[model samples]
Target chain A: SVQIVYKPVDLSKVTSKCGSLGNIHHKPGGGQVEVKSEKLDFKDRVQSKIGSLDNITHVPGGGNKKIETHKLTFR
Target chain B: SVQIVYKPVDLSKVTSKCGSLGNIHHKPGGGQVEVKSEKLDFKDRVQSKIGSLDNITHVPGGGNKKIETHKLTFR
Candidate 1:
């Protein structure tokens, strides 16, 4: 039916599990987890939810503005 | 607890709701939905789940290579 699996993910927190890996750096406010995997599931171990989907891969060189780690606010 | 909300999304399908909108194009093989929203929740009307999250905004000009619509495979 649906070939593409849609899910939500916190770009602010990208980790690597399974065959993936990343480095987590905790900041005063939010933490940043630099992913080092060719393909990330966005869902870590035991995380079986709907909204936790992702881009699968990073933005080639580094990051994308739309998906950057930040304090997303409605104000 | 969590300042950020990690939601998952199917890049292959982007929609707009509650002031957001997009045009759905059904290709010969896969379908494409060009999202047109300042802030798309990824979740439409009754789509209140975890994995239905998004980039909020598009990739500056058009689309990011990573999030581009395609027939993604392991082969």
Candidate 2:
């Protein structure tokens, strides 16, 4: 079980949708949501492009994490 | 804040990823991940493609939720 909580560019926008994806949990301010999935990683499911746009969904953050842990880092 | 808990198909696989994408937390057995992002609906980020796949990445489940409250559900 892993959980990460933080702020994103938009809050309510991402919240109301992933309400059932996992064991959904929100930050105290309701500005962030915690989603739990078994087989897939929800990280960067819709991530910032570091762009002029706010939220852009890209499929780059896909694939196996544990398999790639040798080159990854996180809490 | 919204928080929902449940069981998923795979635990360790998704846990090792997304560890940094959010303020990550793990279920008791570490079989699930709680991800908190500000602007994404991860419900179907990595989803099932009606079979012939264990997981398939699609970009359709992106966009506003509250504005489309009637069009979404969950936490």
Candidate 3:
């Protein structure tokens, strides 16, 4: 069977932020931020710049994490 | 507080496929494939190979989608 599996790519080494919003950080004490509809827009205006794929989606003994994974295929 | 954010990377530009798997393609008529805990195993044999993240996690009027995003930080 054909499949495109996306694994995690560590980016803890990057020293700078890419967007104009601000640096990446979670809410105080650590909590999941759900970007609901209407405010979730990141297409157009950008020529699809390649970005890194490394973040702690699942932390043992933490909480149920639902991190996004990628998979590309051609058939 | 410092953090890291992950953006999508387009793979449609990639001409050839990688890994021991075959080409990528969706099921006929389009459907979602959920990988449960048992089948969701892909962490050992590889050393974190970078992959694309431009998959249709959501479609307008089609159905609800939950795509993964990344955000890294140091504090």
Candidate 4:
């Protein structure tokens, strides 16, 4: 198989009080992907099982930051 | 080698007049990655050598959209 690669994402320039809109995940595999949208406070955390789920990238915590939408994809 | 994977990045939530900042590229290789920052008009295009340079993800064109910053990475 070929290498699975991706680019870096910066969260600083998001500038908006509402952070980024959709946090996307691009993966190489065959599976069903889903989208998750939520409204949470700055200090709140999204729950996930260890190794079962993860953010597409690193998200800043403890700040007034929030990604309004989430998209999970397998390709 | 393990699979090189990444998540999807949404551009719509970037509700600012300026587009997203720090367009990132994540790849699986050992090489020096650089950052490119430019102020291009919505109609202007960023030039690149075919197969040599590329946007980490698909950037929308024809609209008043521009990414303020760029970051390239290897993993």
Candidate 5:
């Protein structure tokens, strides 16, 4: 079992915000979501380009601590 | 704030699972995920095609009840 909680970004600091287009494929338990854009849109792209996924630390535990661990996927 | 909890599927009765390809875009708070395939892989496709999102009832409340509401995206 896993949880992915997306941390909303501060759009104010960002200069250019683009839009994305794709499909979301879901199943029963876990599924895959695809996102892409030539310029902007989607937090994954911003997190992948502007910052680095490496910066996010993975903390293992329960409750609040678990949120921090799962947040490792983004900045 | 919103939560998307995906329920795992029972693959036993199913046959001919396909594969999807795309990107996942992320930001701070929320973003978008795109998925598509000629055949299949992701759950969203399975849910969209096999079943109907219309069938899933939206239950409102907190705690365990909230889980049912968020689970509406897929069956």
Candidate 6:
């Protein structure tokens, strides 16, 4: 017999707002969250993650923000 | 001896007509066709060419139409 434990990760911290362009909001005093490299290529793993790039500067003062989400997979 | 001849610039007279949108039909006295500006930056060199824009009206007696295409290299 095998024992299993299930604990779900809170994704609200990584979920992004639709329509608008930008990164997810972090709670006060909350430091930047780091994503695991193994999760990078997971097709449906990181369904919704938003962030900003440091280089490109064409984005309007409030524009140029973008979001990227992922879906989970069995493999 | 060296001689080269080439001529190709008649995009069906700015072809237009997809699903439903006007512009591109002159059968009696063709006219009005101009496009040239150092060919503007070309990444894939104007992947495709297509055209339209005006003072800006409601765009539907015929409905506002638009097309812009290009893909060349020489700069």
* Candidate maximizing TM-score: 4
lDDT of 6 by residue, B1-75 (tens): 323333323322212123433332212112233333332332231222212211122222222223333322222
Error of 2 at B15 (Å): 30
Please give the C-alpha DockQ score of model 1. Answer: 0.04
Q: Write the per-residue lDDT of candidate 3 for residues B5-71, one digit (tens) a residue.
A: 3345532211221122222222221222222122233333323222323333221111222236444
Off by over 4 Å in 5: A1-32, A35-75, B1-29, B41-75
Question: What CAPRI class is candidate 3?
Answer: incorrect
Evaluated at residue A2, the lDDT of candidate 1 is 21
Give TM-score, chain B, model 1.
Answer: 0.13
Q: Which candidate, 3 or 4, has the higher lDDT?
A: 4
Report how closely model 5 matches the true complex, as a DockQ value.
Answer: 0.04
Q: Per-residue CA lDDT of candidate 2, range B1-75, in tens?
A: 444333222222121122223222212211222443354346444432111112222332232211111112332
lDDT of 2 by residue, A1-75 (tens): 555343212211112212223232322222322353354345544432211112222222222223211112242
All candidates' TM-scores?
0.14, 0.11, 0.14, 0.16, 0.13, 0.14
Instruction: Please state the error at residue B55 of candidate 3 in Å.
Output: 32
What tens-digit string does per-residue lDDT give for candidate 6 at A5-70? 322222212111223333322122122333323212222222232222121223221222223333
Candidate 4 lDDT by residue in tens digits, B1-75: 446566545443333332333433333222333333244233333332211232134433212233333333444
Over 4 Å off, model 6: A11-75, B1-47, B52-75
TM-scores of chain B, in order: 0.13, 0.14, 0.17, 0.18, 0.16, 0.20
- The superposed Cα distance between candidate 3 and the true structure at residue A1, in angstroms, equals 43
Shift of residue B38 alpha carbon in model 5, Å: 1.1
Ranking by DockQ: 1, 2, 4, 5, 3, 6
> What are the runs in model 2 whose C-alpha is more than 4 Å off?
A1-75, B1-52, B67-75
Q: Against the true two-chain complex, what DockQ does each candidate achieve?
A: 0.04, 0.04, 0.02, 0.04, 0.04, 0.01
Predicted complex 2: DockQ: 0.04
